[PDB]
């Protein structure tokens, strides 16, 4: 991915080759959308949106009052 | 105690993906605890995480795509 | 050297209560500001809650040392008067009392550290009136801008566009040129689920909580009715004395239905003869209010009646109407009801509201009633709460005039006047007047090290600036730095700081004037 975005933002480009992910039952790396692995956006935005708000109200607590 | 509210927050938004959730705010704490010893104030380790997280929703706006690959080839056969 | 050696130590409970009271604010300290750090508190009870409010964590506390319940009634004492703020108010005391520890470790007394407090206070508030910007209250537009910008800290931050005139011009009623207390009492907030925030409407008469008679034959509106207070209960006769009734036949059932109604009737006819169209009843949970019979009674005299009345809504009553409780209904008499233009009951999507209007009294006084909607029920409860902290900071400037940049500009300035003051004065005080200022630099210290700014940096940088600029140099947390704190559109009424220091002076005189505890039975 690191090769990949370094031509892609300079709108030129040998080739492309980007979202290359995890193939685990043969155990080497392809492309996920040839693949057919795909996840609605919907799921990732709010995941990371909610993974965050859970991690600040940890990150709030400074003291805590156990009776 | 706030994860277990939070898998209720995320069976009632999307209905799936708890397990990814819980481990993405497992390793932001450790990541931020280590920042706490670094003398780093945990207000900006907030801050510092809302604004990655403003940019990292514009950054998948250039990842997402609508149906594709459905003329001239089959990626959907590959599900089945 | 060697000097007073004192073999019996009171000065281990006075140290004692210090520390156990400066254990206090430190974890209020996390709280102060915006961005300050929520604090975890398990109840008695078990249950687990969250906040960041510190009238809140003093109250689920559950206090036990007494010397540390009584700064639970400083920062009451500071909700009566400010509204707002109760978390800089419990960190300017802890701070006071970590300043005269070191001047208990000097070998001063506290008596004449007590004392001292009070002149530092009093010159302190002096100088607070020095650096007072005088508004007024003929200007909307600035107290406007102080209702909205205050309320951008809530969650709601849209609808306060037309929140703040309308929380203005509701105090502007109240704000009457020449008046010294002013008591928001007077203005009643009525919460009904139904409708947007967008939709508010200010009364000019008195508005109830409670809808009007459900059963058969509710009138539901009546025009130039007479209101009255009747703390008496409509009842069938039921006499507490020893009481028989025989009925040995079947006619004699309809004799006892019959007597039970006249007696109702003869209680709706006294009420009609004074001429009473509206019927406030006390709320009574012991036995009926008022019976269904004799609504039926006062439904055919074309009288509305409104039970379920609370007390807090009597004392209310009484004063914008200017009637008069009535507790019998021997004592029950024209002189002692009220005049009303008209008496409605408002249906807006299910709503049901009665309100009054047409007070048309002489004990007519400044009285006024809002009317509060919303969809979610959740959200009329926080937005009538977010409306009186908006009450409270116009209060602030009608009894104290004028405003003050806030973010630690306030405190710098009287922190560096002291230190010039402190050389002017002689003795052991001179030694205090220093520590008292000193002490005073936790507030704009506390901001920025809940904000994440560098504490040394930024308290620094703000004194540095602070000696050529006066009152604009503060913490600015939208900016994420230092800049000038009135063009950011952060404003702290005088009276809050007013109050701040003279509920401080009391509070750490109390403290240091017990020198032991007893248990006494």
């Known amino acids: 991915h690191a090769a990949s975005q370094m031509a892609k933002p300079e709108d030129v480009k040998r080739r492309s080759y980007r979202n290359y992910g995890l193939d685990l039952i043969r155990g080497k790396i392809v492309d996920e959308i040839h693949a057919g692995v795909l996840e609605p956006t919907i799921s990732k935005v709010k995941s990371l949106k909610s993974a965050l708000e859970a991690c600040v109200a940890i990150l709030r607590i400074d003291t805590m009052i156990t009776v | 105690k706030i994860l277990v509210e939070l898998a209720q927050q995320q069976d009632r938004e999307i209905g799936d993906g708890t397990t990814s959730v819980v481990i993405i705010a497992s390793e932001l704490l450790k990541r931020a605890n280590e920042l706490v010893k670094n003398k780093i104030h945990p207000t900006t380790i907030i801050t510092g995480f809302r604004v990655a997280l403003r940019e990292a929703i514009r950054f998948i706006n250039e990842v997402l795509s609508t149906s594709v690959d459905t003329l001239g080839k089959e990626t959907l056969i590959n599900i089945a | 050297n060697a000097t007073f050696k004192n073999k019996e130590k009171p000065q281990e ?57 009584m700064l639970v009634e400083v920062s009451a004492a500071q909700d ?131 809808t009007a008679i459900k059963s058969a034959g509710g ?11 009747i703390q008496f209960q409509i009842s069938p006769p039921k006499p507490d004395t020893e009481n ?53 009674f006062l439904s055919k005299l074309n009288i509305m009646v409104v039970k379920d009345i609370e007390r807090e809504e009597i004392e209310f009553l009484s004063k914008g109407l200017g009637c008069k409780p009535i507790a019998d209904i021997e004592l029950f008499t024209e002189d002692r009801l009220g005049s009303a233009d008209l008496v409605e009951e408002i249906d807006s999507d299910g709503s049901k509201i009665v309100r009054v209007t047409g007070i048309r009294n002489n004990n007519a006084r400044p009285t006024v009633s809002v009317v509060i909607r919303g969809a979610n029920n959740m959200i009329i409860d926080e937005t009538e709460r977010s409306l009186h902290d908006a009450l409270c900071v116009i209060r602030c400037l009608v009894k104290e005039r004028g405003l003050i940049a806030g973010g630690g500009a306030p405190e710098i300035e009287i ?83 007013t109050s701040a220091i003279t509920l401080a002076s009391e509070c750490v005189k109390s403290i240091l004037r017990i020198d032991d505890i007893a248990f006494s039975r």
Not at chain 3, 13 to 39: E, F, H, Q, W, Y
Not at chain 3, 143 to 169: E, G
Not at chain 3, 219 to 229: F, V
Not at chain 3, 426 to 453: D, H, K, R, Y
């Open chain 3, 415 to 497: 922190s560096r006047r002291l230190s010039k003051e402190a050389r002017s004065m002689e003795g052991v005080q001179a030694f205090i007047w220093q520590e008292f200022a000193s002490a005073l630099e936790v507030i704009p210290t506390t901001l920025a090290e809940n904000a994440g700014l560098n504490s040394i940096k930024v308290v620094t940088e703000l004194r540095s600036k602070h000696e050529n600029g006066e009152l604009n140099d503060g913490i600015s947390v939208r900016r994420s730095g230092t800049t000038n704190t009135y063009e950011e559109h952060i404003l702290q009424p005088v009276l809050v700081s």
């Open chain 3, 244 to 296: 028989n009734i025989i009925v040995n036949d079947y006619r004699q059932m309809d004799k006892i239905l019959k007597e039970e109604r006249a007696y109702l009737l003869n209680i709706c006819k006294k009420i009609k003869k004074a001429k009473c169209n509206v019927l406030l009843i006390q709320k009574s949970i012991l036995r009926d209010a008022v019976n269904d019979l004799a609504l039926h």
């Open chain 3, 13 to 69: 409970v006075r140290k004692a209560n210090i520390i156990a009271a400066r254990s206090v604010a430190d974890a209020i300290r996390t709280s102060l500001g915006p961005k300050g750090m929520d604090k975890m508190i398990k109840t008695s009870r078990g249950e687990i809650i969250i906040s960041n409010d510190g009238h809140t964590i003093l109250k689920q506390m559950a206090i036990l040392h007494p010397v540390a319940r």
């Open chain 3, 80 to 210: 009566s008067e400010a509204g707002d703020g109760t978390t800089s108010v419990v960190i300017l005391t802890g701070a006071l009392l970590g300043a005269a520890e070191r001047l208990l470790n000097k070998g001063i007394h506290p008596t004449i550290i007590a004392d001292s407090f009070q002149s530092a206070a009093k010159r302190s508030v002096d100088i607070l009136l020095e650096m007072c910007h005088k508004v007024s209250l003929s200007d909307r537009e600035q107290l406007v801008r102080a209702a909205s910008t205050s309320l951008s800290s809530k969650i709601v931050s849209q609808y306060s566009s037309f929140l703040a005139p309308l929380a203005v011009d509701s105090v502007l009623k109240i704000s009457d040129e020449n008046s010294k207390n002013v008591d928001l009492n007077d203005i009643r907030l009525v919460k009904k689920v139904g409708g947007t925030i967008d939709d508010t409407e200010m009364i000019d008469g008195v508005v109830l909580t409670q």
């Open chain 3, 219 to 229: 009138p539901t509106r009546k025009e130039k009715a007479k209101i009255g207070l």
